[PDB]
Structure formats: structure tokens, C-alpha cells
Amino acid sequence: GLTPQELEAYGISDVHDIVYNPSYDLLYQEELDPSLTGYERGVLTNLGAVAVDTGIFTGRSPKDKYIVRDDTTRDTFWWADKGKGKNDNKPLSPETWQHLKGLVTRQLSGKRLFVVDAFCGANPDTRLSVRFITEVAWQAHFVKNMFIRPSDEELAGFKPDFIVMNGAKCTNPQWKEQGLNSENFVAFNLTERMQLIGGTWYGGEMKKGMFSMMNYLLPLKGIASMHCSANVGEKGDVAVFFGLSGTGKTTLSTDPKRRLIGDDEHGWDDDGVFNFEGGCYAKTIKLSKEAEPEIYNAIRRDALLENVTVREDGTIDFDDGSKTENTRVSYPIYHIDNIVKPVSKAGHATKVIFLTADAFGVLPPVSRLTADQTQYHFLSGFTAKLAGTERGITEPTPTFSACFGAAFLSLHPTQYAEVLVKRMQAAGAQAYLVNTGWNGTGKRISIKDTRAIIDAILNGSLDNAETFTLPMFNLAIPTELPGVDTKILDPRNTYASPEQWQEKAETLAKLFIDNFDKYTDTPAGAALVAAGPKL
Ligand SMILES: Nc1ncnc2c1ncn2[C@@H]1O[C@H](COP(=O)(O)OP(=O)(O)OP(=O)(O)O)[C@@H](O)[C@H]1O
Ligand SMILES: [Mg+2]
Ligand SMILES: [Mn+2]
Numbered sequence: 001g002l003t004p005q006e007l008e009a010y011g012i013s014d015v016h017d018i019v020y021n022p023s024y025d026l027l028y029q030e031e032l033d034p035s036l037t038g039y040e041r042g043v044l045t046n047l048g049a050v051a052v053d054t055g056i057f058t059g060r061s062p063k064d065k066y067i068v069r070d071d072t073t074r075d076t077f078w079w080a081d082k083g084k085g086k087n088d089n090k091p092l093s094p095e096t097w098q099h100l101k102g103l104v105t106r107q108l109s110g111k112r113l114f115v116v117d118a119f120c121g122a123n124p125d126t127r128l129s130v131r132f133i134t135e136v137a138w139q140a141h142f143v144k145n146m147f148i149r150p151s152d153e154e155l156a157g158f159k160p161d162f163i164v165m166n167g168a169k170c171t172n173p174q175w176k177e178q179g180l181n182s183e184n185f186v187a188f189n190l191t192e193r194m195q196l197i198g199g200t201w202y203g204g205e206m207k208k209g210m211f212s213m214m215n216y217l218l219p220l221k222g223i224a225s226m227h228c229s230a231n232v233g234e235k236g237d238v239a240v241f242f243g244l245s246g247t248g249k250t251t252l253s254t255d256p257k258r259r260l261i262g263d264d265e266h267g268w269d270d271d272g273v274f275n276f277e278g279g280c281y282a283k284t285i286k287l288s289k290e291a292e293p294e295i296y297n298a299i300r301r302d303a304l305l306e307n308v309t310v311r312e313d314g315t316i317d318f319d320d321g322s323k324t325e326n327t328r329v330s331y332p333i334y335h336i337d338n339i340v341k342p343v344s345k346a347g348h349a350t351k352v353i354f355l356t357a358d359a360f361g362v363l364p365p366v367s368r369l370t371a372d373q374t375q376y377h378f379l380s381g382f383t384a385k386l387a388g389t390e391r392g393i394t395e396p397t398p399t400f401s402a403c404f405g406a407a408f409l410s411l412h413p414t415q416y417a418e419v420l421v422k423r424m425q426a427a428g429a430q431a432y433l434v435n436t437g438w439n440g441t442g443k444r445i446s447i448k449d450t451r452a453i454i455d456a457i458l459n460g461s462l463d464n465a466e467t468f469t470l471p472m473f474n475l476a477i478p479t480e481l482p483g484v485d486t487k488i489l490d491p492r493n494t495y496a497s498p499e500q501w502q503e504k505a506e507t508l509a510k511l512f513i514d515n516f517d518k519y520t521d522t523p524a525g526a527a528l529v530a531a532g533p534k535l
Helices: 022-031 092-107 135-146 153-157 204-220 249-253 293-297 370-378 413-427 447-458 500-520
Strands: 017-021 051-052 065-068 090-092 113-120 127-135 162-167 186-190 192-196 226-232 238-242 258-262 264-267 273-275 279-283 304-306 328-332 348-358 366-368 382-386 396-400 432-435 467-470 475-478
Touching: 022 051, 022 135, 051 135, 065 258, 092 162, 092 186, 092 192, 113 135, 113 162, 113 204, 127 135, 127 204, 135 204, 135 279, 135 304, 135 328, 162 204, 186 204, 192 204, 204 226, 204 264, 204 370, 204 413, 226 249, 226 413, 238 249, 249 258, 249 279, 249 447, 264 413, 264 447, 348 370, 348 382, 348 413, 348 447, 366 447, 370 432, 370 500, 432 447
Parallel strands: 017 113, 051 304, 065 090, 065 186, 127 162, 162 192, 238 348, 348 432
Antiparallel strands: 113 127, 186 192, 226 238, 226 258, 226 264, 264 273, 279 328, 304 328, 366 432, 366 475, 382 396, 467 475
């Protein structure tokens, strides 16, 4: 086993108590310690799972994300200040990084620390060995759930490729003088291979931080790194589901008719699709046991609820979004019965689905994309929401996040597109666009109906059917689909008149066109006629 006399070369001193590779049982007792108060304290729910409060931050803080610009990242990273498109990869000086490291290492010094060694990536040949350090038990619990838990043997000869140090309790008072966004920070240094977290307690920063690193390393090696869920059928056929947050990746991949590979982060190499994680991070707002049985059943001892409202009697009010709409629950992947094991990976994907929640109510429930349209929509990374479905009234607001996850991209969008296209062509994969959002009714299509569309896609029903073309976006949609209302197939029918759809389609088309303009600086990018909507 490891010894305390080997964990101070990171700049952490005077650690008297070291809890290495904490067990779920110890994490439980740490979280429910009767004398524990504050944000570290968890509460036991009637479901047997512990629930915690992540504080001020209930989601990621992109504005506080920084990457050190040195000679390791200078000419490879997609920088926020290099006009190559808008992104959160803000350059940080090596000097300021040292200051931040100082804050975090001092905050963790003289404290009882949890050290969790885990893997990011199901394949030994490309996975990262990560060592997580924190003084908060539930943060250690979060990483234990979300990352791949190594075997006793692997832990014996564990050699960290990356170090993640969570100093949530500390803040940076010099941020103004350093030109940073706030007193908080989520910084990355690829030379020292380390991630620092200050101010925010949100565990998600650790999960996506390593995802961001995988997104840097894998594509440069010819391996696609994807923000998608993935599952496989009895026949062995594999599907991947891309989409921005809340579009359905986790909800829809957890499907009774297929084995779950992963719900959020995957790679695609010469052998196939593999999960980067050892757990799932499901959304719990308005959670329905009837609609999502598997996910609900996963909420038990060892799962970790985040920010949900817990009543005096321990019952959970999943509908309460008064604190945040981003209530979550993390759990080891085996909390889902029908998953792929012992290793979360499978063959090449033959079905690539792009999920989008179109608040504009213009995109059809399902359409088959051409090769060029696949690239166009991948780079577009579209989804929409109302200016405030909990704030004001209707006002569809678009979000164009390249590759369906710009916030996690370390390389240029085209680099992800290139590797994805290569893997797709070699596998003869077909792409589909699915609107898990709204139509003319103003009400989101039901999960039941959506699972039916996915069923049709995966079993070939969609491909082996006649289609017509939706104008403006020129999307091929089937005339009918088993277990699906034929009326909704054409979004124009959910409106009192096709004219209403027309006006909104025109607006959305213009948004797409304007958003894509930045990619036309290359001959290939000039592929404006592709999926490219046309007025
Ligand atoms: N037709 C539908 N299809 C999918 N999800 C739906 C549908 N209708 C409502 N929802 C809800 O929308 C949300 C989709 O969330 P999900 O967790 O799948 O997003 P995600 O794509 O996995 O996001 P992230 O990448 O942030 O984890 C869930 O809360 C789900 O209950
Ligand atoms: Mg998800
Ligand atoms: Mn995600």
C-alpha cells in the first residue's frame, strides 16, 4: 500500500491524516458525522442516498476557467484570445499559476486529506492515471463515483499522469491585479499536468476538467474524444448520442432495450467506442420514477445527490428548482443493472445521433443527415431554450456550442470533426438529428415518444422507410414511424398553419447561417451549401 511519505512533492505540507482510496462505507460516515456542520455536511434521504449542498456554485463556472499558456500549449491549444472562435480557454501566465497553486496547496496543508487514485479512460493504452486530492469527503465521493476505480494491483503500481487538487475553500484576493474573472478559479497546467480548483465546491469541475484534458490528448493521437452517451444492442450494434446539456444524452442512453456503455464522455479509437468514466451524472430536476426507472433506482446508498431539496422526514422534493435547475445525482455505473462489463467499451458505432432541444420548435423530431450535413450540424452544436422558462416568458434563445461541447474543447472544433468523420466513414456509420425539444405546441415531446423514435433509428426502421424533405434546413424525414405519431414527423403540422413554422424557421436559419460564417475561412468550411440552412 501507499505511504504518507510520498505525497508532498505536489507542494502540500504538514498533512497528518491521509485517507487514501476511501471506501464507500468511510465516505458515508464522513458525510453524516453528527458534529459536522457547513457545506461538507450531507443529509441522509429516505432513499438511502446522502444528499449534499454544493454552495454558491451549482454548475460549472466557465468564466473562471484558465489554461496556462506555455511552450507545451502555445501552438496546440484553441485559445480564447486567438480569434479562432469564442471559447473559455483563457490564457494564464505561469507566474499567476504559481500563485494559484500556492493558494490551493496552503489550503490543503495541515488538513486531513482524501486522496483518490483513478483512471479516466476505459482503455489502458490511452487512459490517464489521475490522483485527486481534497479536504471534503463528498468531493472525494464524487470522484470515486465518476472515475474508473482501479484494481488493487493497479493501485499498487499507480503512477499519476495528472493531479487534480481541489481547494474549494480558498479564494484568490489578487484576482483583480492578475486580470482574472473573480476570486474563484479552475486552472489547468499541461506542463505540470495539474488542475487547481478554488472558490467553487461544484464537483462537476473535476469531471469536466479531466474530460477537457482527454479532449486535448486523444484527437492529436487520431482518437475521437466525444461529449456523448453510448450503448449497444444485443446484436452488438453500437450507437453514440451527442448533445448539449439537458438534450437527453443520459436520459435516452439509459434504455431498457440496450446495454449502457456510458452516458457522457467517450473515445473512439481503432477498436471502437469506450467510456472515460466509471459512473453517471444524471439530472434530477422533476425526476420521474415512472419515466426513468433505472436512473431512479440508481439513487440509493453510495449515490450522491446534489442540491436537491430534502424535507425534514428525509423525503426528496425532486420538483424543487428554487435553488437550482441543475440538481444532480452521481452514482457508480453499476447502479444501473443493464450495463456493459467488466469494461465500459464496445465496437465501432454504426449509428450517430445528434440530440437537440429546439426551443424554436422548428426542427423535426427526427431526420437522416447527409455526410456534409453531419459535419455542418456537428460544428454548429445547436440547442435552444426560452429567455427564462422560470424567469420571464417565451423568447427562444439559441446556443451554438461547437461539437456539442465547446466548453470542454481544448483543440479547434475542426480537429474533432476530422477525427469523428474518419471513424464514421470507416464504420459506415449513419447520422441522425433528433429534436428532443419542442414543436408548435410549446410543450416538450414526451420521453416515451422520444424513446420510440430512438427505437426506430436503432432497429433500422428509419433507414428502411420513405422520406420527404423539410424546407429551409433541407432535412430528410420519414413519412411514418412505428410507435410514433405520424402527425408530429413534420413539425409544420403541430402549428395552426405552416406559415407560423415558416417565420420561425427563417429566424433560426439566419442564426445558423450567421453562427457558421466563422467556419467558412477554409475551402472545406466553405461547405455552406451542406446541411447549411438556406433562405
Ligand atoms: N423527450 C425527452 N427526451 C430526453 N430528455 C427529456 C425529454 N423530455 C424531458 N426531458 C428531461 O430533459 C433532461 C435531459 O437531461 P439529460 O441528463 O439526459 O441531459 P444530458 O444531455 O445528459 O446533459 P449533460 O451533458 O449536462 O449531463 C432530463 O431532466 C429529462 O427528464
Ligand atoms: Mg448527462
Ligand atoms: Mn455533459
